[PDB]
Motif scaffolding. Structure first.
Motif, PDB file in Angstrom:
ATOM      1  N   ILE A  39       0.871  -1.229  -0.069  1.00 18.59           N
ATOM      2  CA  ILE A  39       0.080   0.035   0.031  1.00 18.59           C
ATOM      3  C   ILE A  39       0.791   1.310  -0.098  1.00 18.59           C
ATOM      4  O   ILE A  39       0.471   2.288  -0.384  1.00 18.59           O
ATOM      5  N   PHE A  40       1.996   1.288   0.903  1.00 17.92           N
ATOM      6  CA  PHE A  40       2.772   2.451   0.796  1.00 17.92           C
ATOM      7  C   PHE A  40       3.403   2.821  -0.470  1.00 17.92           C
ATOM      8  O   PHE A  40       3.483   3.635  -1.207  1.00 17.92           O
ATOM      9  N   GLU A  41       4.248   1.689  -1.155  1.00 21.86           N
ATOM     10  CA  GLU A  41       4.834   1.807  -2.482  1.00 21.86           C
ATOM     11  C   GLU A  41       3.807   2.107  -3.563  1.00 21.86           C
ATOM     12  O   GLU A  41       4.137   3.010  -4.695  1.00 21.86           O
ATOM     13  N   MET A  42       2.574   1.791  -3.374  1.00 21.99           N
ATOM     14  CA  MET A  42       1.339   1.842  -4.253  1.00 21.99           C
ATOM     15  C   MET A  42       1.064   3.227  -4.413  1.00 21.99           C
ATOM     16  O   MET A  42       1.414   3.950  -5.581  1.00 21.99           O
ATOM     17  N   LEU A  43       0.802   3.735  -3.438  1.00 23.47           N
ATOM     18  CA  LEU A  43       0.540   5.095  -3.117  1.00 23.47           C
ATOM     19  C   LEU A  43       1.593   6.155  -3.345  1.00 23.47           C
ATOM     20  O   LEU A  43       1.257   7.494  -3.985  1.00 23.47           O
ATOM     21  N   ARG A  44       2.801   5.798  -3.134  1.00 26.82           N
ATOM     22  CA  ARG A  44       3.980   6.641  -3.436  1.00 26.82           C
ATOM     23  C   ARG A  44       4.355   6.851  -4.951  1.00 26.82           C
ATOM     24  O   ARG A  44       4.539   7.891  -5.546  1.00 26.82           O
ATOM     25  N   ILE A  45       3.837   5.858  -5.568  1.00 30.40           N
ATOM     26  CA  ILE A  45       3.812   5.811  -7.076  1.00 30.40           C
ATOM     27  C   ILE A  45       2.903   6.794  -7.670  1.00 30.40           C
ATOM     28  O   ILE A  45       2.867   7.333  -8.371  1.00 30.40           O
ATOM     29  N   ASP A  46       1.561   6.612  -7.322  1.00 28.90           N
ATOM     30  CA  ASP A  46       0.383   7.475  -7.661  1.00 28.90           C
ATOM     31  C   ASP A  46       0.457   8.906  -7.302  1.00 28.90           C
ATOM     32  O   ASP A  46      -0.135   9.606  -8.115  1.00 28.90           O
ATOM     33  N   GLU A  47       0.852   9.379  -6.253  1.00 26.63           N
ATOM     34  CA  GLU A  47       0.952  10.533  -5.749  1.00 26.63           C
ATOM     35  C   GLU A  47       2.243  11.391  -5.817  1.00 26.63           C
ATOM     36  O   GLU A  47       2.181  12.617  -5.579  1.00 26.63           O
ATOM     37  N   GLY A  48       3.443  10.685  -5.829  1.00 24.29           N
ATOM     38  CA  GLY A  48       4.821  10.979  -5.975  1.00 24.29           C
ATOM     39  C   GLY A  48       5.015  11.778  -4.756  1.00 24.29           C
ATOM     40  O   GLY A  48       4.496  11.433  -3.678  1.00 24.29           O
ATOM     41  N   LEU A  49       5.998  12.528  -4.679  1.00 22.05           N
ATOM     42  CA  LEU A  49       6.783  13.218  -3.378  1.00 22.05           C
ATOM     43  C   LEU A  49       7.255  14.403  -3.854  1.00 22.05           C
ATOM     44  O   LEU A  49       7.981  14.805  -4.675  1.00 22.05           O
ATOM     45  N   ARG A  50       6.707  15.750  -3.052  1.00 19.40           N
ATOM     46  CA  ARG A  50       7.066  17.097  -3.315  1.00 19.40           C
ATOM     47  C   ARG A  50       7.137  17.679  -1.913  1.00 19.40           C
ATOM     48  O   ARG A  50       6.493  17.419  -0.897  1.00 19.40           O
ATOM     49  N   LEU A  51       8.316  18.154  -1.812  1.00 21.91           N
ATOM     50  CA  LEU A  51       8.723  18.691  -0.375  1.00 21.91           C
ATOM     51  C   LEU A  51       8.231  20.101  -0.281  1.00 21.91           C
ATOM     52  O   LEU A  51       8.701  20.722   0.904  1.00 21.91           O
ATOM     53  N   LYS A  52       7.726  20.915  -1.268  1.00 27.74           N
ATOM     54  CA  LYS A  52       7.360  22.325  -1.153  1.00 27.74           C
ATOM     55  C   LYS A  52       5.868  22.283  -1.490  1.00 27.74           C
ATOM     56  O   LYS A  52       5.443  21.502  -2.409  1.00 27.74           O
ATOM     57  N   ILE A  53       4.945  23.171  -0.815  1.00 23.97           N
ATOM     58  CA  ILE A  53       3.492  23.202  -1.308  1.00 23.97           C
ATOM     59  C   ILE A  53       3.299  23.268  -2.727  1.00 23.97           C
ATOM     60  O   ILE A  53       3.790  23.950  -3.580  1.00 23.97           O
ATOM     61  N   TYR A  54       2.372  22.442  -3.145  1.00 21.56           N
ATOM     62  CA  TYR A  54       2.045  22.547  -4.644  1.00 21.56           C
ATOM     63  C   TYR A  54       0.642  22.316  -4.932  1.00 21.56           C
ATOM     64  O   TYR A  54      -0.425  22.208  -4.035  1.00 21.56           O
ATOM     65  N   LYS A  55       0.119  22.514  -6.111  1.00 25.12           N
ATOM     66  CA  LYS A  55      -1.463  22.630  -6.316  1.00 25.12           C
ATOM     67  C   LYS A  55      -1.589  20.773  -6.757  1.00 25.12           C
ATOM     68  O   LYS A  55      -0.963  20.545  -8.023  1.00 25.12           O
ATOM     69  N   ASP A  56      -2.654  20.439  -6.383  1.00 20.12           N
ATOM     70  CA  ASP A  56      -2.930  18.920  -6.968  1.00 20.12           C
ATOM     71  C   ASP A  56      -3.670  19.193  -8.422  1.00 20.12           C
ATOM     72  O   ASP A  56      -3.926  20.184  -9.007  1.00 20.12           O
ATOM     73  N   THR A  57      -4.377  17.827  -8.871  1.00 20.25           N
ATOM     74  CA  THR A  57      -4.949  17.843  -9.983  1.00 20.25           C
ATOM     75  C   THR A  57      -6.036  18.680  -9.939  1.00 20.25           C
ATOM     76  O   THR A  57      -6.622  19.252 -11.146  1.00 20.25           O
ATOM     77  N   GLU A  58      -6.796  18.834  -8.623  1.00 21.77           N
ATOM     78  CA  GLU A  58      -8.055  19.580  -8.592  1.00 21.77           C
ATOM     79  C   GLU A  58      -7.688  20.966  -8.484  1.00 21.77           C
ATOM     80  O   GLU A  58      -8.697  21.812  -8.269  1.00 21.77           O
ATOM     81  N   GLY A  59      -6.650  21.461  -8.131  1.00 20.81           N
ATOM     82  CA  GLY A  59      -6.067  22.585  -7.923  1.00 20.81           C
ATOM     83  C   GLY A  59      -5.740  23.013  -6.204  1.00 20.81           C
ATOM     84  O   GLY A  59      -5.667  24.151  -5.964  1.00 20.81           O
ATOM     85  N   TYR A  60      -5.745  22.041  -5.649  1.00 16.01           N
ATOM     86  CA  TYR A  60      -5.654  22.114  -4.186  1.00 16.01           C
ATOM     87  C   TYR A  60      -4.373  22.088  -3.589  1.00 16.01           C
ATOM     88  O   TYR A  60      -3.699  21.343  -3.966  1.00 16.01           O
ATOM     89  N   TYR A  61      -4.018  23.071  -2.691  1.00 20.81           N
ATOM     90  CA  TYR A  61      -2.882  22.933  -2.020  1.00 20.81           C
ATOM     91  C   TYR A  61      -2.502  21.534  -1.194  1.00 20.81           C
ATOM     92  O   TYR A  61      -3.285  21.296  -0.398  1.00 20.81           O
ATOM     93  N   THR A  62      -1.323  21.145  -1.597  1.00 20.28           N
ATOM     94  CA  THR A  62      -0.973  19.884  -1.156  1.00 20.28           C
ATOM     95  C   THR A  62       0.488  19.973  -0.802  1.00 20.28           C
ATOM     96  O   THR A  62       1.102  20.773  -1.180  1.00 20.28           O
ATOM     97  N   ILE A  63       1.031  18.901  -0.088  1.00 24.71           N
ATOM     98  CA  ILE A  63       2.457  18.810   0.109  1.00 24.71           C
ATOM     99  C   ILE A  63       2.940  17.497   0.375  1.00 24.71           C
ATOM    100  O   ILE A  63       2.181  16.621   0.848  1.00 24.71           O
ATOM    101  N   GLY A  64       3.977  17.005   0.116  1.00 24.94           N
ATOM    102  CA  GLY A  64       4.445  15.688   0.601  1.00 24.94           C
ATOM    103  C   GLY A  64       3.914  14.609  -0.317  1.00 24.94           C
ATOM    104  O   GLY A  64       4.073  14.694  -1.709  1.00 24.94           O
ATOM    105  N   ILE A  65       3.407  13.564   0.157  1.00 23.12           N
ATOM    106  CA  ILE A  65       2.612  12.546  -0.498  1.00 23.12           C
ATOM    107  C   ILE A  65       1.384  12.248  -0.583  1.00 23.12           C
ATOM    108  O   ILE A  65       0.697  11.605   0.001  1.00 23.12           O
ATOM    109  N   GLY A  66       0.918  13.379  -1.433  1.00 23.61           N
ATOM    110  CA  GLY A  66      -0.535  13.484  -1.461  1.00 23.61           C
ATOM    111  C   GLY A  66      -1.276  14.029  -0.368  1.00 23.61           C
ATOM    112  O   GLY A  66      -2.508  13.579  -0.267  1.00 23.61           O
ATOM    113  N   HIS A  67      -0.585  14.771   0.574  1.00 19.82           N
ATOM    114  CA  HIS A  67      -1.521  15.135   1.721  1.00 19.82           C
ATOM    115  C   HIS A  67      -2.020  16.618   1.655  1.00 19.82           C
ATOM    116  O   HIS A  67      -1.618  17.627   1.409  1.00 19.82           O
ATOM    117  N   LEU A  68      -3.363  16.392   1.496  1.00 19.65           N
ATOM    118  CA  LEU A  68      -4.157  17.634   1.078  1.00 19.65           C
ATOM    119  C   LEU A  68      -3.982  18.706   2.055  1.00 19.65           C
ATOM    120  O   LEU A  68      -4.225  18.511   3.391  1.00 19.65           O
TER     121      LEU A  68
END
Ligand SMILES: [Cl-]
Ligand SMILES: [Cl-]
Length: 162
Positions: free
Chosen positions: A3-32
């Motif tokens: 489950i960890f490796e799976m989700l790490r492949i789907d969400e990636g890893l970013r260390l700076k706030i970014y915007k997700d596919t829906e345009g929301y502020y996220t950071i890390g491993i898909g953490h909204l």
């Protein structure tokens, strides 16, 4: 694969706030962080999640830590939900990972729309469930990831992910 490796492949890893596919502020491993439009409201939530003044940046350890909490919460939410529980309990280990993935992405409430697919999964009608899953905003908005999760439900293997 798990489950960890799976989700790490789907969400990636970013260390700076970014915007997700829906345009929301996220950071890390898909953490909204928040659905508001304010970068400041997202820096504040981050700060609060980490327990320090981050200035919108976190380390690999901090990202992994949030990730660990988010998987744990996804699983616990599934187990507490009367509609999800029985589906999860009926599935094999691979397929459980697939349901967790969907809950991590869309929340128990996004998953609400899947009444029909969930019933088909519970019945073990793989092919049918796969078809039904695909008729959804989910599938049309993030087709590649949706295909990978779907194939995981159809097949019961991690092939979509090797
Ligand atoms: Cl948090
Ligand atoms: Cl995708």
């Amino acid at each position: 694969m798990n489950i960890f490796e799976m989700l790490r492949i789907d969400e990636g890893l970013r260390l700076k706030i970014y915007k997700d596919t829906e345009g929301y502020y996220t950071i890390g491993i898909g953490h909204l962080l928040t659905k508001s439009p304010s970068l400041n409201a997202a820096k504040s939530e981050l700060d609060k999640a980490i327990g320090r003044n981050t200035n919108g940046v976190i380390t690999k350890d901090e990202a992994e830590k949030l990730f660990n909490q988010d998987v744990d919460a996804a699983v616990r939410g599934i187990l507490r939900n009367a509609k999800l529980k029985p589906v999860y309990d009926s599935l094999d280990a691979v397929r459980r990972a697939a349901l967790i993935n969907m809950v991590f992405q869309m929340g128990e409430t996004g998953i609400a729309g899947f009444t029909n697919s969930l019933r088909m999964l519970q019945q073990k009608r793989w092919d049918e469930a796969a078809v039904n899953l695909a008729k959804s905003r989910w599938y049309n908005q993030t087709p590649n990831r949706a295909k990978r999760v779907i194939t995981t439900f159809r097949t019961g293997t991690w092939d979509a992910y090797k």
